[PDB]
Design a protein around this ligand. Structure first.
Ligand SMILES: Cc1cc2nc3c(=O)[nH]c(=O)nc-3n(C[C@H](O)[C@H](O)[C@H](O)COP(=O)(O)OP(=O)(O)OC[C@H]3O[C@@H](n4cnc5c(N)ncnc54)[C@H](O)[C@@H]3O)c2cc1C
Length: 409
């Protein structure tokens, strides 16, 4: 029976970083990663940014070069997926029926997009832009002359995808069910800014737009059936709504968790010797006042990968890192630190008209988050304020003429 000391399932950010972290902390056993995609670990943020826009090759988005994995003795079974697991037998079953045995297991499977077809079948070219493969198809379809795109969801991915699509000179309609874009991740100051910016770039942006399902001709997408129930014609649909954690096999095996899979501060699930990291793993977060949340970011994947590995190496260090995020749309470079969710005050810092400003978020008089559009100084210094839970007057924060670092006691 094929067996590894550590088996990593998923070869994305979590998986790759998990393997890197293992070796960097001196792990010497066999390390095997099983990833359902055919290519070596590559970065996902480019899929709605520089890669989709053909400013980077595939080589320049790879997490590590091919030779690195050879050097670090990281074995990889690509184009293979774990279909189930037996936590008792410490065993994993693959899509071809074969079984691999593990000492420790790291579940880094991320999530998958919602299926939104009117008649339930897969449609070209409906894209979540979550794989290199999918991005490549969208790119090919654009070359071949597809010109009417409908983006579903006003989250970061949706906006980014919309933005790069306008660079291709095609028609872009964005649909947001909520009263504003970014409603789940930022305040109204940011929303207004991005809505205004996108519209100025030719995007037909529609809020309170509730969608039913995606129409096709049996082979390809032709429109988006709304709930009202008009149809918007489309030859391209971008699905940018909440993903579903690829967690099924864990739940089936008895792992606890309502939203993905639950893990402690060492990224351990309720099943012995199995960890979960990245998009699929829910965790109690200090910057969310103890609530068990499921962050979907590179920072989070990186940091959970580290904690799982350190624990596996026998030198555990809790996952206590400060959450951060970024979004690149047009010439707008957003950098976010902390979690704004549940803020009671959002202080505008600078002038949105200059397209370089910050929003400082507070809760109960304490700084909890920053959104920084082309404002790296505020982002860098703001981290300290977020970590300090700094109690600074809004009247002080709002003065862009004073550096944030000067404000803390
Ligand atoms: C278009 C796009 C843009 C993004 N931009 C940003 C950004 O700008 N900044 C930021 O912080 N975050 C961004 N993100 C989010 C970030 O990429 C994710 O948080 C990160 O990928 C999570 O790491 P992960 O390992 O948990 O999931 P992933 O990196 O997605 O890796 C999961 C891998 O596991 C594989 N898998 C699934 N099921 C199985 C199975 N059963 N067996 C084996 N393998 C399996 C999948 O094929 C996938 O390759 C973006 C995401 C997308 C989709």
């Amino acid at each position: 029976a094929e067996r590894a000391d550590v088996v990593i399932v998923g070869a994305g950010h979590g998986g790759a970083q998990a393997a890197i972290a293992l070796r960097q902390n001196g792990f010497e056993g066999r390390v095997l990663v099983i990833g359902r995609e055919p290519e070596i670990p590559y970065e996902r943020p480019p899929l709605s940014k520089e890669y989709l826009a053909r400013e980077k090759t595939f080589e320049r988005i790879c997490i590590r070069p091919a030779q690195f994995w050879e050097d670090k003795a990281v074995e990889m079974k690509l184009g293979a997926e774990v279909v189930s697991l037996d936590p008792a037998a410490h065993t994993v079953k693959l899509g071809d029926g074969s079984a691999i045995e593990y000492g420790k297991l790291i579940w880094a499977t991320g999530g998958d997009p919602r299926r939104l077809s009117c008649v339930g079948a897969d449609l070209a070219g409906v894209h979540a832009v979550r794989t290199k493969e999918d991005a490549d198809r969208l790119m090919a379809e654009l070359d071949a002359g597809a010109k009417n795109a409908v983006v579903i969801g006003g989250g970061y991915i949706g906006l980014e995808a919309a933005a790069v699509l306008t660079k291709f000179g095609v028609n872009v309609t964005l649909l947001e069910a909520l009263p504003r874009v970014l409603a789940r991740v930022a305040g109204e100051a940011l929303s207004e800014f991005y809505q205004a910016e996108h519209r100025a770039h030719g995007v037909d942006l529609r809020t309170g737009a509730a969608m039913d399902c995606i129409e096709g001709d049996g082979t390809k997408v032709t429109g988006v059936r709304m709930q009202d129930g008009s149809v918007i014609p489309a030859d391209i649909v971008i699905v940018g709504i909440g993903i579903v954690p690829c967690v099924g096999a864990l739940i089936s095996a008895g792992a606890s968790g309502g939203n993905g899979v639950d893990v402690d501060e060492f990224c351990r699930t309720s099943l012995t010797d199995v960890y979960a990291i990245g998009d699929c793993a829910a965790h109690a977060n200090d910057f969310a006042d103890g609530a068990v949340i499921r962050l979907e970011s590179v920072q989070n994947a990186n940091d959970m990968a580290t904690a799982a590995a350190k624990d596996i190496c026998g030198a555990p260090v809790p996952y206590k890192a400060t959450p951060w995020f970024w979004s690149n749309q047009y010439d707008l470079k957003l950098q976010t630190v902390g979690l704004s969710t549940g803020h009671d005050n959002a202080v505008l810092r600078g002038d949105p008209a200059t397209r370089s400003f910050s929003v400082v978020y507070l809760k109960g008089g304490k700084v909890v988050a920053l959104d920084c559009v082309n404002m790296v100084k505020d982002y860098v210094q703001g981290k300290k304020l977020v970590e300090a839970r700094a109690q600074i007057a809004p009247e002080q924060l709002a003065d862009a003429g004073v550096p944030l670092k000067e404000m803390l006691a």
